[PDB]
Structure formats: C-alpha cells, structure tokens
Amino acid sequence: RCTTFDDVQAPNYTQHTSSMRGVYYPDEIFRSDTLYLTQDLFLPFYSNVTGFHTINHTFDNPVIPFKDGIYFAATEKSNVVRGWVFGSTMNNKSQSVIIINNSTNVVIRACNFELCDNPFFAVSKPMGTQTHTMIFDNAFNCTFEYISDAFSLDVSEKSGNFKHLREFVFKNKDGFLYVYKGYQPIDVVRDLPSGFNTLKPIFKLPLGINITNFRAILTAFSPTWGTSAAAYFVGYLKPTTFMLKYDENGTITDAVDCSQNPLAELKCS
Ligand SMILES: *[C@@H]1O[C@H](CO)[C@@H](O[C@@H]2O[C@H](CO)[C@@H](O)[C@H](O)[C@H]2NC(C)=O)[C@H](O)[C@H]1NC(C)=O
Ligand SMILES: *[C@@H]1O[C@H](CO)[C@@H](O)[C@H](O)[C@H]1NC(C)=O
C-alpha cells in the first residue's frame, strides 16, 4: 500500500556549490606516487549543485534525471536519507533497482517494482523506532538480489548540527551501475561544506538496466506525517579532464580540474 502526504510544500531547488568534491578513484588500477591525467565523467570544481532540503512541511523527493551519472551528498544527524530508486519510467512497466538501508540490512533489489510515488520509511518520534517501510506495493521479474549482513542502526531523531556527510557517485557504464562512496564528519546547520574527499568504489552492479531517472528514499518522523531536518545534494557528472595526484601511499590526496581556468590548464598544473 502506497501513501501520499497531505500538504507538502513544493521543492525550492536551492543552488549550492560542489567546491572540490566528487573526486573518485576512476578505476581499479593501483597507481602510486604519480600524477594521472584522464578524461572521464567528473563533477567540475565549484559546479552548481541542487539542494533538496527536508524540514517542516517540506519533504523533497521528486523524480530527478540521472543523465550521465550523479554526485549525491547527504548532510545527516537522524539518518533521514536512506536510499534511492534508480530506473526510467519509475513504473512497473520497466526495471528499477532499489538501494536502501532499512535500519538492519543494506538491500539492493532490481525488479519490475510497483513503486510508491511517495516512498518513505516512517519512524515514531516519541518511541524512536522505525514503524513503517512503504516503498513499493508489488514486484515481479526480479533480476538482482543483495542483502547485507545484519546490523543495528540508530533510527531515532537527533538534535543539533548535522554530524555526518555521506557522499556517493553513481555511474551507468558498460552495463554496470558503479556506486562510489565516501564519508566524513561535519557539524553544520545548512549547506554543503567546502572540502575535498575522494570516493571509493563500493559496488559494481551487473544490472544492465536503463537508468534515466532516480528518486531519493527518505524518512518521515511521526508522533499523519512529519519531518526531521535533513538535506541531500545532486550534482551532474560531465566529461572533463582531471589530473589526479596519487600519493606515495596510493591515495588520491589532490586533484586539478583542468577546465577550471588556464592556470589549472597548465597541462595541467
Ligand atoms: C530489512 O530488510 C531485510 C531483508 O528483507 C529484512 O530481513 C528479512 O526479514 C524477513 C522478515 O521481515 C525474514 O523472513 C528474512 O529472513 C530476513 N532476511 C535476512 C537476511 O535477515 C529485515 O527484517 C528488514 N529490517 C527492517 C527493520 O524492516
Ligand atoms: C502494476 O502492475 C499491476 C499488474 O501487473 C497493475 O494492476 C498495477 O496497476 C500496476 N501499478 C500501478 C501503480 O498501476
């Protein structure tokens, strides 16, 4: 059973900056102590980024075009952003893959899903426990199934600053859904803080599905819906030439966006 919310305020599509975020290890090669020039799908430095903010009567989960791949950040203190649906029609007329953390397991399922237009987890604000999981009402022709080892995640509403910055890069390449991940702690009340955090590949999903759109799977907090403060950010990957500095320990510690300006475009420098 799918549930829509009553009086949702429309999204504002606020604009923010990506600073120097979104850099990821572009492949599996273990380069070390070198500079590496490549042309790949990168998020250019100081690109515009769309901020979807959940607060008060606002609950931003619209269908967002996937295009050539995305950078996706989330500023969190109450584990609101819990997953994504990647697909095309977002109907059960086509294949979709759901990638979620449902508070005990990480689930990745590629099926013909009867998606809820307003998919959400629901948590009791007084009881502090997850009560509902309403993402789809039916599923058939399931093509991919992954369920992680069990864990225990704090689902309850928290107060104060956003303490967790969770970054991801999603690409559809060679029939695979590449999922890159990075994390860093923060303490901020708004916006996507400036910084640099290389993302590492965590999934290379052999789905082979058409992914033109996606939707964020969020968390409503009820005491009959309600919200808790959160925000995610979508940037679009573009074909760009980057120079990645692989340190002596094999770590990407710095990068130059060669299209940023002629000073950067010193071949590059
Ligand atoms: C998160 O999803 C997992 C996977 O569907 C759930 O684990 C399964 O739960 C069902 C009953 O709900 C059991 O029959 C299965 O044996 C479980 N599978 C595994 C691998 O443990 C889990 O219960 C879900 N968590 C929440 C909080 O809904
Ligand atoms: C999903 O497919 C079933 C039949 O397979 C159909 O009854 C249902 O209406 C579809 N979903 C939606 C949202 O229409």
**Whole-angstrom distance, CA of residue 233 vs CA of residue 158:** 20
Closest ligand to residue 117's CA: 2
State the DSSP string of 203-237. Answer: EEE------SEEEEEEEEEE-------EEEEEEE-
**Whole-angstrom distance, CA of residue 140 vs CA of residue 203:** 23
State the DSSP string of 130-187. Answer: EEEEEEEEEEEEEEEEEEPPP-----S---SSEEEEEEEEEEEETTEEEEEEEEEEEE
Query: In terms of residue numbers, what domain contains 113?
Result: 1-269
Total number of domains constituting the chain:
1
* Ligand 2 environment, Cβ below 6 A: 92, 114, 138
Instruction: Calculate ∠ Cα 219-111-136, nearest 5°.
Output: 35
Alpha carbon 19 to its chain's center? 17
Pair 193, 144: CB distance under 8 Å? no
**Whole-angstrom distance, CA of residue 263 vs CA of residue 269:** 7
Which residue's C-alpha comes closest to atom 20 of ligand 1? Answer: 147
Buried-state track 4-33, b at ≥16 Cβ within 10 A, e below 16: eeeeeeebeeeebbbbbbbbbbbeeeebee
233 alpha carbon to ligand 1 midpoint, in Å?
29
102 alpha carbon to ligand 1 midpoint, in Å?
9
Selection from 268, 248, 254 nearest residue 30 by Cα: 248
Residue 67 makes CB contacts below 8 A (sequence gap 6+) with 236, 237
Model resolution, angstroms: 2.2
Q: How many CA atoms lie within 13 A of 151 on its CB side?
A: 12
The strand pairing partners of 73, in sequence order, are 167, 233
* Ligand 1 environment, Cβ below 6 A: 102-105, 107, 130, 133, 147, 150
**Which of 92, 112, 113 to mutate to test ligand 2, by most ligand atoms within 8 A of the CB atom?**
92
175 alpha carbon to ligand 1 midpoint, in Å?
29
91 alpha carbon to ligand 2 midpoint, in Å?
8
